[PDB]
Ligand binder design. Structure first.
Ligand SMILES: CC(F)(F)c1cncc(C(=O)N[C@@H](Cc2cncc(Br)c2)C(=O)O)c1
Length: 167
């Protein structure tokens, strides 16, 4: 039993809710919140900018130190950093950005990072400003993630479309 509430169950292990991931993180304090990161951990907009703003820029400060030490992530890769006031940990995961021409096949590799964590609160990778089709992202999520994932979808119209078209 966990503290996630109001989710619709899509599969044995994938759940979905129309919610603001920032507000959901603030209420649940999950062990892991996933950030829709880029390879530079520059949290300017989309989910990343919203999460970072909610940490009063502490996420960005920590991220800049991480990059200065380790260099950029790989597209499809991830790193675990602090969750600050939102979660115990933040798993920064880099999905491919279609608006940069990155290969969409890397979306499966990106979701594989979720399997290293038993339970996660997450957005749909490569959705929103990353330019992928969220319906495709949900399909890859369901077919790749085996751990328990609670997906927060900010846009109500998109949420209803994701549920209604789900196979
Ligand atoms: C063009 C379109 F029709 F596909 C479209 C339009 N608007 C929003 C999205 C979207 O992917 N939203 C997700 C992911 C998300 C993105 N950025 C910020 C947050 Br916070 C959450 C959501 O709401 O959870 C997609």
């Amino acid at each position: 039993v966990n503290s996630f509430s109001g989710y619709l169950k899509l599969t044995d292990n994938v759940y979905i809710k129309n919610a603001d991931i920032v507000e959901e993180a603030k209420k649940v304090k999950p062990t892991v919140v996933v950030n829709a990161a880029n390879v530079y951990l520059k949290h300017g907009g989309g989910v990343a900018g919203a999460l970072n703003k909610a940490t009063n820029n502490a996420m960005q400060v920590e991220s800049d130190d991480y990059i200065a030490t380790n260099g950029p992530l790989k597209v499809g890769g991830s790193c675990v950093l602090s969750g600050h006031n939102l979660a115990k940990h933040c798993l920064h995961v880099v999905g491919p950005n279609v608006n940069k021409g990155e290969d969409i096949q890397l979306l499966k590799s990106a979701y594989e990072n979720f399997n290293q964590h038993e339970v996660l609160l997450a957005p749909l990778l490569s959705a929103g400003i990353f330019g992928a089709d969220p319906i495709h992202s949900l399909r890859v999520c369901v077919d790749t993630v085996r751990t328990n994932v609670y997906l927060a979808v900010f846009d109500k119209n998109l949420y209803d479309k994701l549920v209604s078209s789900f196979l």
